[PDB]
Symmetry: C4
Subunit: 223 residues, 4 copies
C-alpha cells in the first residue's frame, strides 16, 4: 500500500509529488541549521525543526513497518534523527560533538540524487588508492617537515619552533594552497620548500587517474 507510494517515485502522480516535499523539507532543515549561528539571531527556529523531525520520523516509520538495516540508506536516516531526542532527555566537548553530528542531514539527498550515489559507489570501489594517497602524503609531510626545521634552527626568529609545528606548512605547500602564514626565511629553507612544492605536485598527481577512471566507468554505465 504505502510501500509503493514511498518506493516508486515514477509509478503515479500521487507518489511523484511526495518526493518534492521530501526534498523541500531536507533543504529547509539544511538552511535552518546554518542560520542559528548568525550573531543577529543570537523560538522560531525550534517550532520548524520540530516539524522537520516529525516528518523525518513519519517517513522512517512508514517504510519501517512495510518492510532492512543492511543498506547504507537506512543507517543515514537513523543518524539524522538521533540528536534531537538526546537533547530532549536532558561535558561541553560532548555537547559540541553531538551538535556537530546534525550536519548529516545533507546525506539524505542521496536517495533522490543519482550522481551522489555514483560518487558513493566510486568511493567504495577505490579504497586502496585513497589509502595509498594518504600514505604517500604522510611520508612526504614527515620527510619535509624535519629538513625545513633543521635548516632554520640557527635563526632566532624562525616560525618553525618544532618538527610537529612544521607539519601544517608542509601540507599547505604540497597541496599548492599556499596560505602564506608560515614561510621559510633562510636560503636552505627556501631550497627545501622549492623541492617540497614539486614533490607534493607529483605525489598528488600520481594516484588520481585511477579514481577518475572508476568514476567515469560508473557514470557511463549508469547513464
Amino acid at each position: 500500500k504505502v510501500w509503493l507510494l514511498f518506493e516508486y517515485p515514477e509509478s503515479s502522480q500521487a507518489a511523484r509529488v511526495v518526493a518534492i516535499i521530501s526534498v523541500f523539507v531536507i533543504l529547509l532543515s539544511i538552511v535552518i541549521f546554518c542560520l542559528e549561528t548568525l550573531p543577529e539571531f543570537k523560538d522560531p527556529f525550534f517550532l520548524i525543526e520540530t516539524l522537520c523531525i516529525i516528518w523525518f520520523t513519519f517517513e522512517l516509520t512508514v517504510r519501517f513497518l512495510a518492510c532492512f538495516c543492511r543498506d547504507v540508506m537506512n543507517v543515514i536516516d537513523i543518524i539524522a534523527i538521533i540528536p534531537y531526542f538526546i537533547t530532549l532527555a536532558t561535558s561541553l566537548a560532548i555537547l559540541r560533538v553531538i551538535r556537530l553530528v546534525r550536519v548529516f542531514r545533507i546525506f539524505k539527498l542521496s536517495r533522490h540524487s543519482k550522481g551522489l550515489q555514483i560518487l558513493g559507489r566510486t568511493l567504495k570501489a577505490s579504497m586502496r588508492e585513497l589509502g595509498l594517497l594518504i600514505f604517500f602524503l604522510f611520508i612526504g609531510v614527515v620527510l619535509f617537515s624535519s629538513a625545513v626545521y633543521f635548516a632554520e634552527a640557527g635563526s632566532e626568529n624562525s616560525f618553525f619552533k618544532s618538527i610537529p609545528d612544521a607539519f601544517w606548512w608542509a601540507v599547505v605547500t604540497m597541496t599548492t594552497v599556499g596560505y602564506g602564514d608560515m614561510t621559510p626565511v633562510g636560503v636552505w629553507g627556501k631550497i627545501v620548500g622549492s623541492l617540497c612544492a614539486i614533490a607534493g605536485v607529483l605525489t598528488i598527481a600520481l594516484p588520481v587517474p585511477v579514481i577518475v577512471s572508476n568514476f567515469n566507468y560508473f557514470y557511463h554505465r549508469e547513464t
Copy 2:
C-alpha cells in the same frame, strides 16, 4: 543584395573588408568601456560611443530587413544595444545593474571567431556535468564549513564567527586558491583544513575529463 555582403565574408573583397570594421568597432567599444572608470578621466567618451551605437544599430537593421530571433546570435545583438536607449529616456542599484550589462559587448566577437563558437557548443552540450560539479562543490562546502566552526568555537579570537561566514574560506581552500585572509588557528581546525584541501582537489578533478573530451571532439570535428 546586402544579405550576401553581411553574411558571406569570403564571397568577395567588398564583404571581406566589412568584417574588419565590424571587429575594430567592437574592440574600440570594449576599450572605451574600461577607460571611463579610471580616476584620471573622472564628453570625448560619449561622442564615440554614439558612433559605435549607430554602427551597431545599422548592422542589426540591415540583416533584420533582409531576412530570425530563434538563434542566440541575434539575441546578443539586441542586448548590446538596449542600455544606451534606456539612459537616453531619463534606484542606484538599478543604475549599477543596467550599467553592468554593457559588458555584454564582448560576446559579439562570437560571430567572427570560431573557437568561441566551439566553446559555446561545448558548454551547451555539457550542462549535466556542470550541474553535478556545482552540486558536489556545494555539498563539500556546507560539509566543511561547519566542522571548522565547531572545532574553533572555544577560541575567543577566531575569525569564523558563524557557519555562513566560513563559506568563503571553504571555497578558497577547495579550489586551492588560498588567499590566506582567513586561516584556522587550532589543531583541530588545521586537521579539518588538511582534509578539506584533498577533498576539494578530488571533487574538482572528478567531473572535468568529460567536458574536456566534449571540447576535444568538437574542436577536432570542426577543424
Copy 3:
C-alpha cells in the same frame, strides 16, 4: 676541416671535448650574468665576460666561414653577441632594454640539448592552441574584472578603484595562484570570486591536452 669538428660531436674524441668547453663557457656566462646585481659586488666581472665574448665570436665565425641564416640556431648566436659591441661604441629605458636582452645566452644550450629542441618544435606546432588559450583568458579576465568592480562600488574602502585595476586580481584568481594582496570584501564580490575561480580552472584546463599530446608525440618519435 673545421666544419666536421664543429658539427659532428660524436665523430672523434677531438670534437667531443670541444662541446664540453662550449657548454662550460655558456654556463659560466650565465652564472656571471646574475652575480653583477648582488649588492655585495656593487673589474673581475668584465675580463671574463670579454673572454666569453671572444669565444662566442670565434665559434660563430668558424662555422660562418665554412658554410645559412634561415635557421633559428644561427639567429640566436647573433643576438647573444650584439649587446656587448653596442656598449663599447658609447635614454635610461633604452639602457635597461639593451641590458635585459643579454639574458638570451641561455638559449644557446638548445644546440646541445635535445629536450629543449623537442620543446621548441612542440611550441612551433601548437600556435593555434596557445592563441585560443590567450583569447579565452582575456575574455574571462575582462568579463570578471567589471562585475567585481560594480559589486563593490558602494564600499568606500574597496581595493578595486577601477576596472583596469581589477585586471591583476582576476588573472591571479583564474590561475589559482592567489597572492592575496587584493581580495573581495562584500558578499557579492565573494560570490563573483567564487565563480571566477571555477571559470578560470575550466578555461585553463580545456586547451592543454592538445599541446600535451603534441609534446608526447614528438618526444616518443625523436627518442
Copy 4:
C-alpha cells in the same frame, strides 16, 4: 632456520607475528623522533631509542649471518643504525647534518609495504623525465627572474633587490603556490608575473603524463 622466519612473512604464524613488531618498532621510533623537539619536553626518550636500536641491530645481524649489499634494502638498514653509534663515540653544522639523517627511519617501511616499492620502481624508471622537468623549470626561473627585476629597478621600494633574490618568487609563481610574501608592484612587473603563471603551468604540465603512465603500468602489473 631464521632466514625463513625473517624472509617469509606468510609461511607460518610464527613469522607473521614478527612483522607486526617490526612495523610497531619503526612507527614508535618515528613518533619518538618528532617529540624530542617539542618545547614542553625541552631521559625517557633515550632508554626507548636504545631498545629500538638494539632491535634494529638484531634484525640486521640475523639476516647478515644467514645470507648481499647489492640491493637497496640492505643499504637503508645500515644508514638507519649509523647515527646512534657516532654520537656514542663522542662543528655545529656537522652535528645538525648528522642529526638530520636520523629521519631515514621512515624508509624501512618499504620492505613491508608494496605501494612504496612500486613508487620506488617508478622513480627509478623515469630519471630522464625528472631531469627534463628540472631543466625546464630552471630555464623558466632564470628567464623570468631577470625580467621582473629589470622592469622594477626604477621603484626605490621594490622587494626584488637583485636577480638571485627574485628566484624564490619565480618558483613560487610557476608552481602556483603563491605565498604572497613578494609581489610585483609596477604594471610591467604585473605583466611579467601574468606571463610567468601561464608559463609555469605549461612547464609543469608537460612532463607528468609519462611518469603517470609508468606508475599506472607498474601498479597494474604488480597488482
